Symmetry: D2
Subunit: 292 residues, 4 copies
């Protein structure tokens, strides 16, 4: 459902830039085998920006089909226009997905009242659970704790993916919401720290290529075994950093390809192929994690 190691799964492509079913199946089977808790389909790492709404929906539905009830699937459903986010969410109503990951509007920099109205309107047009997603480095907007508090009062707003990397937010939000509101890290390099402070899991980029380690790290964290979890964290720390050596998901797609998890590392413009230097950096990080 909404705890533990949740993968922000890549949308693997063929050389033409369209979804590769065989690759997607291999990834999903990998996550089932590895103990991943849930899959976020067509979030940021899944190239939401460069799929059209139909393509996006096809990937989500394919991912649900391939998961075949073995692993819960959360759909990316954000938009910077409220009407468009409502449309997208409505596509998944009564679909099998367990909830939605919905990003603060990007580019148009709404106020906190705007963010409140946007997410409230979206929640009102679905029965699905909603996970808010805050990532100001990408959006130009910052969904502050006070506003998360106001939104957490809406019945089906049930958690947040907090991708600021600002660890003070964990307890700021926790004090304004009920004990069942879920706090998930959106920042792999700080996620263990984030769980140590009270968070419930991570929506992870690193879990694409280190799924078993991430699941084990998160289990240990949930049980309060921080020192054991840190050892795993330290082995993964170069990936947590170097998967952003070039823009996400350029490095993680290459890593998936190098590990034999996907057929090609193709992306859509304006994402471009990994540089030679980037390959060498990511390769070293994979070697450090024991994956290669």
């Amino acid at each position: 459902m909404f705890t533990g190691s949740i993968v922000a799964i890549v949308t693997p492509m063929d050389e033409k830039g369209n979804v590769c079913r065989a690759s997607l199946k291999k990834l999903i089977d990998y996550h089932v085998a590895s103990g991943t808790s849930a899959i976020v389909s067509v979030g940021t790492t899944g190239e939401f920006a460069t799929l059209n709404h139909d393509e996006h929906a096809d990937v989500v539905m394919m991912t649900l089909d391939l998961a075949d009830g073995r692993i819960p699937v959360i759909a990316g459903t954000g938009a910077n226009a409220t009407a468009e986010a409502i449309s997208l969410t409505q596509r998944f109503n009564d679909s099998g997905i367990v909830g939605c990951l919905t990003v603060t509007p990007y580019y148009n920099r709404p106020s906190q009242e705007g963010l409140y109205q946007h997410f409230k309107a979206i929640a009102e047009h679905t029965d699905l659970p909603q996970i808010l997603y805050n990532v100001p480095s990408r959006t130009g907007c910052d969904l502050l704790p006070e506003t998360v508090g106001r939104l957490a009062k809406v019945k089906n707003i049930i958690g947040i993916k907090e991708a600021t990397g600002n660890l003070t937010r964990v307890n700021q939000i926790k004090e304004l919401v009920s004990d069942d509101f879920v706090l998930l890290s959106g920042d792999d390099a700080s996620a263990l720290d984030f769980m140590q402070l009270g968070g419930h899991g991570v929506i992870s980029v690193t879990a694409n290529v280190a799924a078993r380690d991430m699941a084990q790290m998160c289990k240990l964290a949930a049980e309060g075994h921080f020192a054991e979890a840190r050892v795993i964290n330290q082995r993964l720390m170069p990936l947590h950093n170097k998967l952003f050596v070039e823009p996400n998901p350029i490095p993680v797609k290459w890593a998936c390809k190098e590990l034999g998890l996907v057929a090609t590392d193709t992306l859509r413009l304006p994402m471009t192929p990994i540089t030679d230097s980037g390959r060498e950096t990511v390769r070293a990080a994979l070697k450090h994690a024991g994956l290669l």
Copy 2:
């Protein structure tokens, strides 16, 4: 026309959020009479995020129809997916627009090489002049002078709307491009400074309500009469700042309503109505400018 005072025009809406032809007509007449150089249609200030492609195109064509050859129209054509930007541009080829204003991809944070490929691909598939648009505070990425220099070698790429407010960019770019490449400010509060450093004009929010003063300011600047231009700028400075007291174009639409230029100040979610405190601040700024 790509120099002087260029208005980033509001998209006036009725109470249902649909484009108000009558209000738009009144704005376009105002710009023609007030000496505005050109109209940017469905830019940021025109709520490009919350119009769908069809609506966006309708507004541009309506603007061209109402302008009736009396003022040049530049279309907002940016996207964060290169295929989508190409597609949107094709809809305007042979429309009568004089050029396009194309923003760096937002949210996905491409590399400089990605930006280069993005804009090169867009330019390749049109004969329309392209004006690059850099606004890191909205997009999460920053198109740097080195990359602007690379792109300025593309025949069709003719200028940049530089909205960082970082005035060192003027001469960093100027020294890498030819004399005929246009440097336009996208930051009203620093625009006169930008012109004094060698910029050619401004793509302006303030121009929506102070069109004549903007046009005269930019002419005086182009002639080197900076002290005279500065007097105008000082009367407009509160508006340059307070049109962003709440997210653009919330204040400017309320200002246009208050002057009588549009029938309603309605916006689309996630933009929300101006607060009372914002009305007060904006009205005071209009009065400082001598407009009310």
Copy 3:
């Protein structure tokens, strides 16, 4: 020694701006009674910048005398010139102080190698334990974890006061140093979070006026009772923030005066008296903490 609630004690003054012995005695007795773990004398909150070296030394020695072995005393000994920091430290050698709090050089923005050489040289000219102090908002310099690691190899460099407010630093530093290196927060508003992550205590501004609450919060933290500690934290959160409503130690001196702990709230220029609005804000924070 170097754990729990450590007060960054004010240097109380008379109306002429010189140390008030009676006030200092009242504070010290308060900290003994309250369970404060140690006193940092003439740190930042003690107005190190505006005492001359003789005055600084007189305050430290007076504080040691008044403490009368009841509470350990750590001297502020930082300087932005290495020779000057060595001179100051040498004043306290064989004095009774238990260690030194030594800030990264300010203003001159040395490199990390510079910071390494500065602190190594200082440590070499004393047998006293050294606590490094990182506060980039004040110094223009940031002592990174890697360099803290290099310094922690020097026998008498034994801990750090980490005043970035960046909670990721706790585990970054912890992984590079031995298990006996002390990690203390320098940021009251994040300090409980900092202890939750592995830190050992706080050098606190808030402890000047909430000494018993701070000591109890830190004891609960050390014992792993985070939820009980948070309740205390929440009552103190407005002070942790509002003691910086005007520049430290302007608010905390006023609060000390209002509580009857010191005779006057006088400071030395360029610190200036608290504003009326500041008094009202700090008063409300004191009322929230139950102290007034």
Copy 4:
């Protein structure tokens, strides 16, 4: 003289870190012959942080003695304690200096009112012209245009060395002060831009090694010949940047040694010797400038 190219001169040292009279003489002769407007003695670049008051005064008096009336000398007189700044200023009254350069207090982060009181008190107790110095990246505080406007009403406060690199400050300050208040850049890389916007000169690091080119650049700027000035600036731009590749004045002292202007590149801790990579970068910048 408070206009044109003003050098922030190095304090040349022998291998023991004491001032080298012979090297200083050679620098002063160089500045006299190269048309530098004035010499700032024991500013930032002159290692004011690591000289004691007596040494600082000795260097200023030695500079005046060697200058022998042939070039004006401005003393660095700032401090972070207002009494200390007053005291240091008194040592120079009737010395033959033409003015003082006085930095905003560093480390203690005073309010704007504190800055106002600080500088007003210093100005009150001298008849020497005072030049305010704003450099937030070093001090932790930012003297804002509104406060500069307040201080410019003090008879003795005659200008500002604005080292933010934020070029919007030029005209924000200019509009609040009289026509005779001097605006000087303290950021070599943006200095020509600063002059083009209405600044009167530059207090320069680059001028230590490119005195003639700096002097001609600033004259051309003062005459309005910006394109001609820009040609010079483009040859100096790598030096403007690479003199800060390691902390100032590490690079510039090594550059002066490499040109033969000083006998040693020695600095005081916490400044440390230039790295090999830094030598390479700086030498390349000197060659681009045509100096080697």
